[PDB]
Design a protein around this nucleic acid. Structure first.
Lengths: 508, 399
RNA sequence: GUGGCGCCCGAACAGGGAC
């Protein structure tokens, strides 16, 4: 009906075979004779092991997406796959053979060999070739090559008449016009999506949370629920996943805090499932809320109180970050989610003093065309990193040996305040900040400690609030409970104020 | 028509990551297909795309080139067609670039380069794709201008034959020329008409000029060391600048911080202290000694908004081997769109890089990889780049 | 006997930084 070479023939054996379709070759030969899919055979060969699809292992021959809420609500669905392959190259139109008897009857297969590494793209190219005249006649139609079936749109019985005529226009190249489309059920039964104009969503979901298991079922249910959580909001697995670090047999359950949350999470889903369709007329309104404890959520919706879709934000990295770090990350990620579903960008309506971040943004080492939509959440740092002084010019620092370095930091102060840090098996960097935190804890509210290493400055400068190392959380709390703070950074091997008197403790 | 064979030598068919950009680019693609320059064939095989909106324009201009293949095939086409790095840039008043981008698009296109003429045509939500956007001189391929070296010369012939002091150079989407600018503008008007004669087009205005750019001479930390804070910052940069300006010596600096005082301790200056202070301030403020640019050695970028919407943008290869001390300030229609502001600022400076040594090496802009990949199109003006959130070392030029 | 995509993780190359 229509079509559009070589590799950059072959010989390929198989392994012990299935006797069920053992004579399927002699029957598929006739099936393909009629649809001219194969010929009768030049040493060419690939492997074959399967059944009742008498397919072949083209692995050896190889060796030789839209969003459920990503479509409007025109009154029509069109889903139809013609097989849909053996209906449309010569060096490759003969080498596809196979056999495993007890003449090794192989022959010259010559039609689309579903399974060749790349055939899907050719199927899509022809899919598009068929759609080309469809848009020529009525480009008002929407088509999606989600699968080898159709996702068509034409807003009905009247529209269905013209739709049948098109299905028949497909029949020209030997395409199907079957009266058996999945029109009856909007829910896309296939490929796990409870589709419906009125409401879009994933259809498949369950969670057997009864026994105490934590091996693989936990990973499966966390990733499934979250990957499915597109429009299932009220769930989080940052904690739950953060503890499962490279396990598939370790049976050790989670905390009761996370577990408790999990219970709620499970229960919430029970609530009805209705994700909204796409809205071309108007854009969406977006609010992102921190789920507490680094946790963060976001909704993308054009209907207020009718959340069209949801999203999360817990993508962290590096050592320390801030609410603004999560915010920026989440914004980029939601932006891309928007570009994938709609293309536009929803109203970034969340609770921040924009001036306050503005100063943040001009603080950081970092395009949120947004608004400061107020809401109870608290999106802000809790430390103010000044650019001027107030603070007895502390002299914290410390060196050690490359071998082990056995922690053991120390710190002095221009008023006489000296403090050591016998850190057991600690590194120079770690101990520097730990000893400084210790100097900070007894410090007044106005406390400026001049650092002696880059790492410390690097982090402090970036207004770190979250904390994975308890020492970091400790300084976070100290910085919040403090008001006047001035931070400085300096090298060694130079000598100023007090820095050698301090650095004379590398070992002892 | 006429053309010549390949000078090829990579195959990274990857192209790029807007519903309106895709609803507006299709227009140019269809226009070109109507005339016929780019084929719509994308199913068979396994290049980058961009849209732009700059000064003096209303539509969205198509954008296409592949740095991976470009650089891969740079050797032969560029070496066989090498510029004598015409350094006649200082002695001028202004220069414009070639708005025309289809004069070379009228050449007898190539075919063998179709397998290396990759393109792309994405689909919203993986739903509505296009096969593909093709041939020689599509929209770029620097070597391609070199292949239009004969066209550029054919044109420079009468142009410079009219204006001897009017020197004619070529650039990707740009030509390169302190006489009266008005005469520069007429020269361009007459060259636009000339092009018209032999079927060429010329699709306000910036018209970059040499007389404006300069070398920002870095300044001192403070007038005096009243406070150890100021002197500490000063010495910190001296020590780190030592890799560039080695004259920084602490034979007495450390001893200068005589007592173990505090950050803001009031401080006058002595004789040797103030003497060394003046000596080295001038020292650094001296010219750039031993730094000389060689187009054979590539360069590197260092861009940062320097806080308040300003910009600290350099161009240098070796550590502390600064070839250009450029800066940036006053982003019009900016000062609150940080990304954009430095995008345009850094584009500008790219041009200054090109005039300093010819090229514009990869950048290390500070935007989040996501942020840059998500807002480079919004204000795309003119490559492969990295990312830094680095500490203060450029904080030695001024404030 | 296998793979597409996805997902949970791991390993790893490169680069930078620090000692």
């Amino acid at each position: 009906i229509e079509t559009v070479k070589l590799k950059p023939g072959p010989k390929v054996k198989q392994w012990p075979l299935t006797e069920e379709k053992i004579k399927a070759l002699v029957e598929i030969c006739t099936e393909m004779e009629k649809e001219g899919k194969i010929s009768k055979i030049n040493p060419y060969n690939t492997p074959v092991f399967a059944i009742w699809r008498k397919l072949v292992d083209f692995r050896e021959l190889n060796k030789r997406i839209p969003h459920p809420a990503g479509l409007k609500k025109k009154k029509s669905v069109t889903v139809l796959d013609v097989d849909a392959y053996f209906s449309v190259d010569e060096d490759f139109r003969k080498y596809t053979a196979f056999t495993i008897p007890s003449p090794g009857i192989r022959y010259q297969y010559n039609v689309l060999p579903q399974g060749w590494k790349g055939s899907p793209a050719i199927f899509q190219s022809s899919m598009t070739k068929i759609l080309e005249p469809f848009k020529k006649q009525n480009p008002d139609i929407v088509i999606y090559q989600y699968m080898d079936d159709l996702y068509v749109g034409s807003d009905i019985g009247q529209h269905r008449t013209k739709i049948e005529e098109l299905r028949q226009h497909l029949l020209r190249w030997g395409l199907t016009t079957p009266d058996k489309k999945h029109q009856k059920e909007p829910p896309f039964l296939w490929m796990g999506y409870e589709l419906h104009p009125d409401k879009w969503t994933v259809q498949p979901i369950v969670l057997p949370e009864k026994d105490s298991w934590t091996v693989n079922d936990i990973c499966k249910l966390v990733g499934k629920l979250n990957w499915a959580s597109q429009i299932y909001p009220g769930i989080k697995v940052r904690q739950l996943s953060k503890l499962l670090r490279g396990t598939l047999t370790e049976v050790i359950p989670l905390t009761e805090e996370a577990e408790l949350e999990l219970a709620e999470n499970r229960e919430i889903l029970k609530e009805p499932v209705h994700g909204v369709y796409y809205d071309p007329s108007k854009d969406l309104i977006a609010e992102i809320q921190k789920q507490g404890q680094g946790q963060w959520t976001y909704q993308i919706y054009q209907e207020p109180f009718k959340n069209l879709k949801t999203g999360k934000y817990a993508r962290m990295r590096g050592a320390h970050t801030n609410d603004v770090k999560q915010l920026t990350e989440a914004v980029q990620k939601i932006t891309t989610e928007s570009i994938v579903i709609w293309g536009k960008t929803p109203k970034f309506k969340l609770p921040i003093q924009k001036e306050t971040w503005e100063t943040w943004w001009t603080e950081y080492w970092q395009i949120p065309e947004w608004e400061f939509v107020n809401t109870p959440p608290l999106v802000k740092l809790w430390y103010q990193l000044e650019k001027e002084p107030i603070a007895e010019t502390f002299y914290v620092d410390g060196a050690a040996n490359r071998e082990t370095k056995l922690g053991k930091a120390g710190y002095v102060t221009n008023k006489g305040r000296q403090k050591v840090v016998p850190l057991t098996n600690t590194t120079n960097q770690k101990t520097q900040l730990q000893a400084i935190y210790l100097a900070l804890q007894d410090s007044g509210l106005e406390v400026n400690i001049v650092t002696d290493s880059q790492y410390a400055l690097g982090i402090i400068q970036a207004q770190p609030d979250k904390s994975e190392s308890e020492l970091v959380n400790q300084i976070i709390e100290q910085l919040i409970k403090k008001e006047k703070v001035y931070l400085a950074w300096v090298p060694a091997h130079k000598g100023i104020g007090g820095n050698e008197q301090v650095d004379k403790l590398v070992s002892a | 028509i006429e053309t010549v064979p390949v000078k090829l030598k990579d195959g990274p068919k990857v192209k790029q990551w807007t519903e309106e950009k895709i609803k507006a680019l299709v227009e140019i693609c269809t226009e070109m297909e109507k005339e016929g320059k780019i084929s719509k064939i994308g199913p068979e095989n396994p290049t980058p795309v961009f849209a732009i909106k700059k000064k003096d324009s209303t539509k969205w201009r198509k954008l296409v080139d592949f740095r991976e293949l470009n650089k891969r095939t740079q050797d032969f086409w560029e070496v066989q067609l090498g510029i004598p790095h015409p350094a006649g840039l200082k002695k001028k008043k202004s220069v414009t670039v070639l708005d025309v981008g289809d004069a070379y698009f009228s050449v007898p296109l190539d075919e063998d380069f179709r397998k290396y003429t990759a393109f792309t045509i994405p689909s919203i939500n993986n739903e509505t794709p296009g096969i593909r956007y093709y041939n020689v001189l599509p929209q770029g391929w620097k070597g391609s201008p070199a292949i239009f070296q004969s066209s550029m010369t054919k044109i420079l012939e009468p142009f410079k034959k009219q204006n001897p002091d009017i020197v004619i150079y070529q650039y990707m989407d740009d030509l390169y020329v302190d006489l009266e600018i008005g005469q520069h503008r007429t020269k361009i008007e007459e060259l636009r008409q000339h092009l018209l004669r032999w079927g060429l087009t010329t699709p306000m205005g910036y018209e970059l000029h040499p007389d404006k750019w300069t070398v920002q001479p870095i300044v001192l930390p403070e007038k005096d060391s009243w406070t150890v804070n100021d002197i500490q910052k000063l010495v910190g940069k001296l020590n780190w600048a030592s890799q560039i300006y080695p004259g920084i010596k602490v034979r007495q600096l450390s001893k200068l911080l005589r007592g173990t005082k505090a950050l803001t301790e009031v401080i006058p200056l002595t004789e040797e202290a103030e003497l060394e202070l003046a000596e080295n301030r001038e020292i650094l403020k001296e010219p750039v000694h031993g730094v000389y640019y060689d187009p054979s050695k590539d360069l590197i970028a260092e861009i940062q908004k320097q806080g308040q919407g300003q910009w600290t943008y350099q161009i240098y290869q070796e550590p502390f081997k600064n070839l250009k001390t450029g800066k940036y300030a006053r982003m019009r229609g900016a000062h609150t769109n940080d990304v954009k502001q430095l995008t345009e600022a850094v584009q500008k400076i790219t041009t200054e890089s090109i005039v300093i040594w010819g090229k514009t090496p990869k950048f290390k802009l500070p935007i989040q990889k996501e942020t840059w990949e998500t807002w480079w199109t919004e204000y795309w003006q003119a490559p492969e780049w990295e990312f830094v959130n680095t500490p203060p070392l450029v904080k030695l030029w001024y404030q």
